[PDB]
Amino acid sequence: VANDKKPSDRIAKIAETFVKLMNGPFKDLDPLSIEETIERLLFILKVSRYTLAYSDIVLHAEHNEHWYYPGRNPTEIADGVCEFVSDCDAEVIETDFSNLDGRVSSWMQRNIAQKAMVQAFRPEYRDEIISFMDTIINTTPHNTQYNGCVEFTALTFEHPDAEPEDLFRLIGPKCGDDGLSRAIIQKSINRAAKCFGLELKVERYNPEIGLCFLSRVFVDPLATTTTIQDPLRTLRKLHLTTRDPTIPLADAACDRVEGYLCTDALTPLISDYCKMVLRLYGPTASTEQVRNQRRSRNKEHPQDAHLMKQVLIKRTAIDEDQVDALIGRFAAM
Amino acid sequence: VANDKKPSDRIAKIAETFVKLMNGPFKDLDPLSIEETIERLLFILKVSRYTLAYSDIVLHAEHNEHWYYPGRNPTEIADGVCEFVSDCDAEVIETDFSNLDGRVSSWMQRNIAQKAMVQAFRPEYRDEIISFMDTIINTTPHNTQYNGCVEFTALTFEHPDAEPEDLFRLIGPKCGDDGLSRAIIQKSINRAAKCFGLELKVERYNPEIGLCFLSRVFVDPLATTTTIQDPLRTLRKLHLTTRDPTIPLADAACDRVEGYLCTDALTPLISDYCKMVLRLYGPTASTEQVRNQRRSRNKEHPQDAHLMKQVLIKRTAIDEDQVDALIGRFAAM
Amino acid sequence: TRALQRAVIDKTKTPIETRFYPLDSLRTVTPKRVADNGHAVSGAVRDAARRLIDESITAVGGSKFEVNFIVGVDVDYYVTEPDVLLEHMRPVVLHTFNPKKVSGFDADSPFTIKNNLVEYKVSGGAAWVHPVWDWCEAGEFIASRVRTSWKEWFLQLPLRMIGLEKVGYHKIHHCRPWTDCPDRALVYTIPQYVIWRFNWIDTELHVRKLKRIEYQDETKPGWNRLEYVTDKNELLVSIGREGEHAQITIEKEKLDMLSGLSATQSVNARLIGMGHKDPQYTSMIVQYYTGKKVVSPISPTVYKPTMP
């Protein structure tokens, strides 16, 4: 659903200041060769060749590590999240956007992303990048840029008397559709989204139900960095498999449970399901080398185990006796 | 809720006379250096650097100690309150303002606080102070200035034929949202607040229910200076803790009860609650050094014990037999 | 011509900013009505204006040079020309009389215009007979002389013989804050800089010098004409016979469509067509159309006593 909601006059100066702060000290850049882009990490290649270099140079710089979390290993993500929650003393807010790529306006697209790319890249490459942006208007970096712009707008609205550089220095971790911010702008974020024309969903941090971030649940971010898959999103749908019909059910289930072990080995109410899938569909599945040579293969802390159990129970609103009964039923099947 | 209720023509002369009396003999002043302001006692610093010096120089002078109680130790506050009640022979009135910083009008802000600051500080610093005031319009000293202005207006309305200096010499203790005044202007204070456009709440002093001041209750100000936390405000809410979710309940309760011991050790119906909190949450709480190294740590006369007990009972409107039953129930839990 | 480039090279500009903090408190101020009910009085309006300017000057922290920085209230008569006030090149604030009506009742003091001078007759105070110096016309930049000692006058004598002059520039604003007294305005000024100007060369910015207004209409002798702007982007015209009380306010468009008619009967028919039925309006319109001249008499007037 395309939208053409231009922002107000005042917000334009805030957006320009945010873009300039994003530029930082990297005035000049050069495009990457086709071979280097191909070995990095059709239609994706032509934009990737420039966008990967732009991200790696500007968005992964010294003065842009405060907010651009997108682009780091999951261990690095967990470390950053724990550091941010320690800094904010467990006072953080979560942002959940609905169809951001389908809702970003033309003015935002042509005044944030296009401006940033043109300022980052060399003048001799202006035509190619502008043509690529025009083709885009009619991937990953766009969401991060939108999140950074919205964070800058919120910070500018919260403290209009501070210098833009100091305001932007407080930008918390942001990664695409998910991000973190101070809880003091919980109500003012909705007005900023309305001014830009975006829809924002915000939820106050609650230790009883855990914290939601990148479909990951932090059981107790104050002390431990233990983290698990989001139970709210996956439990209601994990019993149904959305793989293509051509794949046997056993191979898809095996890949799903292998990923779950790789990410959620010691999570209550999921380990039992994964083990029962491995016990039932496991022997009936095909050879694992066969599925490793098949395209659809990629189409999918012990100390606080008690606390993780209680946090999962709080997340799923299931009584402990009910949880034990469910665990017994799952294991005995 | 911003308001633009300018005062009447006559009140302007009263306000100017009050401002001049506030100026007193301190015509010239100088700003404080950044280092001195930092070691005194971002956004707070830029205004504090001037306002702390202005308060210390003018508001803490010989001829401005009659009303500016704000800025002294609690022992000094108790001594001042007892002296004032002895002077007024237990005939005093209390003022309780609702959202004064959210209700002071533009005319009041630009004709009391701005005028006082400009007259106090040196001419060469006029631009900086005026810019800071303009930023403020669109902390502690403002409330005291508003209270002093309202007291001066009430005194001027009560005795319009006396000299302004003699009128202002009768200004009683005032501290932000709380203050003391003569009971003879109990009814005329409402009209003065209406003229300025402010809302005032006044209550006649009653020895049976004690006197309310700075959330402190004077059990018998006529003879003893013994004082306790306000029971009306805290008893109905002390059972619920408003700390952030990241802190364990035990640490917050321990800090609350430690503060209560530091201020209300021998107060009936609160000592028992504090001791029971220390007995229950105490052992289950974390290390006290850990909470001393944690940010959220600061986010919280035996002779007249009988009289204090009776004054607390009168304040809480609870029968003595009912009080004894409640005390027994609290201790035995 | 080359005179343009010559003058441009001859800049001799010396801008000065003596910590003249902008009086933003006075600027962008919501209009207010001084009187609680009925209508105000000249004393009340003057007191309110004095209070406003005084509190503004107190907030800004600066001083003033009150004349019975620079401040003047209803001193149009006391000041022969505004150039004497502007020559100091200092901020100047005035509470003057720049009416939007040719005549009628000003505040509580009736007034009328004879010749190009205002026959102002205050209810309490001496009657004033002074012109108006074209304050609220289009433009923000003004040209005015600068104070110079007689010794400096002699020094420049050889220099002024060619036609050189020292000219100051200022910025303008007024507010018209009182709805009950729209004929009065709160002028605001800000000096900019000083330069040297050749007499026989033009200026790009069309800077004007304050001049006496010419209310009389050469096409309609014995009548005074005037027109102003309205909140709703409407251009209204006020007309009336000179030295006489009556006046009427009408849209310039309707007056234009009326003026070119040939028959007074046609004029009356057109007026009837627009729904205007008040004889006091249509009769005056016809009188202006026909340019009827009447020798209004001079009669004694009996005013009220001031009720302080």
From Swiss-Prot, chain C:
Effect noted on mutating residue 39 to A: Complete loss of RNA replication
Q: What is known of its domains?
A: The N-terminus is important for both membrane association and mitochondrial localization. It may also contain a RNA methyltransferase (MTase-GTase) capping domain. The C-terminus contains the RNA-dependent RNA polymerase domain and a structurally disordered region at the very end.
Q: What is the lineage of its organism?
A: Viruses, Riboviria, Orthornavirae, Kitrinoviricota, Magsaviricetes
Quaternary structure (record): Homododecamer. Forms 2 stacked rings of 35-nm in diameter, arranged in a crown-like structure at the opening of virus-induced replication vesicles. Interacts with protein B2.
Task: Tell me the organism.
Answer: Flock house virus (FHV)
In its miscellaneous comment, the UniProt entry states:
The viral bipartite genome is composed of RNA1 and RNA2.
Function noted in UniProt? RNA-dependent RNA polymerase, which replicates the viral genome composed of 2 RNA segments, RNA1 and RNA2. Does not need an exogenous primer. Also possesses a terminal nucleotidyl transferase (TNTase) activity. The TNTase catalyzes the addition of nucleotide to the 3'-end of plus- and minus-stranded RNAs, probably to repair the 3'-end nucleotide loss. Forms the open necked connection to the cytosol of the virus-induced replication vesicles. Mediates viral RNA1 recruitment.
Question: Which family is this sequence assigned to?
Answer: Belongs to the nodaviridae RNA polymerase family.
Q: Which residue intervals make up region (Interaction with host mitochondria outer membrane)?
A: 146-163
The cellular location(s) given in this protein's UniProt record come to: Host mitochondrion outer membrane
Q: Note the residue range shown relative to the complete protein.
A: 55 to 395 of 998
Stretches for region Homomultimerization? 1-308
Cite the residue spans of the region called Capping.
37-195
* Source species, domain of life: Viruses
Please state what the protein is called. Answer: RNA-directed RNA polymerase
